[PDB]
Design a protein around this ligand. Structure first.
Ligand code: 5FA
Ligand code: ATP
Ligand code: MN
Ligand code: MN
Ligand code: MN
Length: 292
């Protein structure tokens, strides 16, 4: 019943014309997909990107999430979440952890992978486009509690936990190749992506149409604005509030007939929206960085 958390990837290069990486490990004599256990304080996407680079030598950009594999181990239950990950280069060198890496088209990869669950991941990988662009919709971090004033406090800041959530979100959002930054017109939303702003040296665009008060006054304008942002070149991060996100996500998924595998709305959480030719093809809910 104790869960060991891990993450990994279908790492690919070049539609089933791509090649995917399959690794061999001499400790187990197995062929499998690269993956590994989360370190203290990592989230799954951070661990996936790190373990990809450690086991294959390649850097990569994560995209669509491809489901979860569990299996019993002496410690309890091993849990692996998998992402599609596009190689951004690197070179493999054999060692004692991983002694071989082969790049295979999907069909021959399916023959090489010994675990049925890995084959299931790879089937998911091919079901939808993999060369995707990415929108990251983030609910701001923890910011104490609303006062008894009607509606909303413009300037309430992140609390200490929330500031730490903001710092922890840099690595997670960098894992998906975030490039451009947007925040609803509340201090707490800006402060959530300010650490990422500093890392990228990028300015945070301000978004009055995406606050809770605006969504409630004019939801059509909020939806239009999301699409406008998503249509721009780059991979945008959009930080907004709890009353806004569920409605926007549900609307987009409905219209494009995308089924989210997980759902939630926690402060510090992230929705990874994968697009192919402007069409939504994945909506993946990630837990806040300090929650399970
Ligand atoms: N998809 C699957 N379904 C069922 N069983 C699977 C399986 N994959 C591996 N095993 C089987 O479980 C045992 C532990 O392997 P593991 O879960 O891959 O263990 P691990 O902790 O050695 O490997 P990672 O989780 O990949 O850990 P790291 O990369 O973090 O390890 P590191 O310390 O080498 O970095 C092995 O005998 C293996 O054949
Ligand atoms: N005074 C209030 N007026 C209206 N809604 C409130 C009020 N207080 C709490 N809520 C509701 O409860 C939720 C959580 O409020 P809390 O004070 O914990 O966080 P918050 O930082 O304001 O969150 P968000 O900015 O995501 O709405 C809000 O999203 C809102 O739906
Ligand atoms: Mn591993
Ligand atoms: Mn490893
Ligand atoms: Mn490891």
């Amino acid at each position: 019943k104790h869960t060991v958390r891990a993450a990994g990837a279908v790492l690919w290069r070049d539609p089933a014309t791509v090649e995917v990486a399959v690794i061999h490990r001499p400790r187990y004599d197995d062929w499998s997909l690269p993956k590994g256990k989360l370190d203290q304080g990592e989230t799954e996407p951070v661990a996936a990107a790190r373990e990809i680079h450690e086991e294959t030598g390649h850097t990569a950009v994560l995209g669509r999430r491809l489901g979860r594999v569990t299996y019993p181990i002496p410690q309890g239950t091993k849990r692996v979440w998998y992402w599609a990950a596009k190689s951004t280069g690197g070179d493999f060198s054999p060692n004692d952890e991983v002694d071989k890496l082969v790049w295979l088209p999907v069909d021959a990869a399916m023959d090489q992978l010994q675990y049925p669950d890995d084959r299931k991941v790879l089937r998911r990988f091919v079901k939808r486009p993999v060369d995707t662009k990415t929108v990251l919709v983030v609910r701001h971090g923890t910011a104490g509690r609303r006062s008894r004033y009607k509606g909303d406090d413009r300037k309430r800041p992140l609390d200490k936990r929330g500031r730490a959530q903001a710092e922890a979100l840099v690595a997670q959002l960098m894992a998906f190749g975030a490039t451009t930054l947007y925040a609803a017109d509340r201090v707490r939303c800006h402060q959530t992506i300010e650490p990422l702003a500093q890392e990228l040296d990028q300015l945070i665009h301000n978004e009055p149409l995406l606050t809770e008060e605006a969504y409630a006054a004019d939801h059509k304008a909020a939806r239009k604005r999301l699409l406008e942002i998503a249509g721009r070149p780059g991979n945008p991060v959009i930080c907004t509030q709890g009353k806004v996100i569920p409605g926007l996500i549900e609307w987009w998924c409905e219209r494009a007939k995308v089924r989210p595998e997980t759902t939630g709305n926690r402060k510090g959480s992230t929705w990874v929206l994968s697009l192919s030719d402007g069409e939504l093809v994945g909506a993946d809910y990630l837990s806040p960085p300090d929650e399970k």
